[PDB]
C-alpha cells in the first residue's frame, strides 16, 4: 500500500514453477523405459491408457504417455520424450515422440502422420 512500504520492501513478482521438468528447458530428453504400464484415467473417463516410467538421461525418473493406436515398446527401450500432460492420467506430464529412437511410428496412420511419426506412405 504505502509508498514508504513499497520503498522498504519492493513489489516482488512470483516466479514460475514449471509443469514439465524436462530439466533445463530442453525441447526433449532421452530416457530408458523402466516399466511399460497401462493404467486407467480419472473420474469422467474410462480406458486402458498406455504409458511408461522412464529413467531420463539426466537422472529424473518420469512417467510418460505413449500416443497413437498400438505400439511396440518394452522394458529397456530407449525413447525420446517431450512436454505434454494428459489430464485423465494425473501425474503424467510428458509424451513419447513416436518414431524417435527405438519408438516406432503408429502403424497405418494416414491423417496427421507427422504427429505419431509416420512416413508419407508410398502413394
Amino acid at each position: 500500500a504505502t509508498v514508504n512500504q513499497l520503498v522498504r520492501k519492493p513489489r516482488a513478482r512470483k516466479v514460475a514453477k514449471s509443469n514439465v521438468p524436462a530439466l533445463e528447458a530442453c525441447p526433449q530428453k532421452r530416457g530408458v523405459c523402466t516399466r511399460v504400464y497401462t493404467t486407467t484415467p480419472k473420474k469422467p473417463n474410462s480406458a486402458l491408457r498406455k504409458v511408461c516410467r522412464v529413467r531420463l538421461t539426466n537422472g529424473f525418473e518420469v512417467t510418460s504417455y505413449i500416443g497413437g493406436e498400438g505400439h511396440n515398446l518394452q522394458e529397456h527401450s530407449v525413447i525420446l520424450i517431450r512436454g505434454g500432460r494428459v489430464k485423465d492420467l494425473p501425474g503424467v506430464r510428458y509424451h513419447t515422440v513416436r518414431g524417435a529412437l527405438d519408438c516406432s511410428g503408429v502403424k497405418d496412420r494416414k491423417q496427421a502422420r507427422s504427429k505419431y511419426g509416420v512416413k508419407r506412405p508410398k502413394a
Partner: protein
C-alpha cells in the same frame, strides 16, 4: 576549489582520523519519493581542530592513506 563538500562531523575522536557525514536528498529511482542517502568520508585535518557536531567544508585531495582522499578547508559552527 574544484568542488567542495559540506557535511557535519560525526567523529573527531582520533588523531586526525576525522570522518564526516554528508547528506543528500534523492528521488527514489522507482517510487519517486525522496529519501536521505548519507555518505561518510575519511578526511584529513592536520593538528586536529574540528569537533563532533561541527559543520565543515571539505575538498578532494590525493590519497593520504588507504581511506583518505580528502582534507578539510574551513570550519563552520560548533557546540551543537
Amino acid at each position: 576549489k574544484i568542488r567542495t563538500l559540506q557535511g557535519r562531523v560525526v567523529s573527531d575522536k582520533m588523531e586526525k582520523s576525522i570522518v564526516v557525514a554528508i547528506e543528500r536528498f534523492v528521488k527514489h529511482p522507482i517510487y519517486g519519493k525522496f529519501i536521505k542517502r548519507t555518505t561518510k568520508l575519511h578526511v584529513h585535518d592536520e593538528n586536529n581542530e574540528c569537533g563532533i557536531g561541527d559543520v565543515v567544508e571539505i575538498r578532494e585531495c590525493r590519497p593520504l592513506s588507504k581511506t583518505k582522499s580528502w582534507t578539510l578547508v574551513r570550519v563552520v559552527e560548533k557546540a551543537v
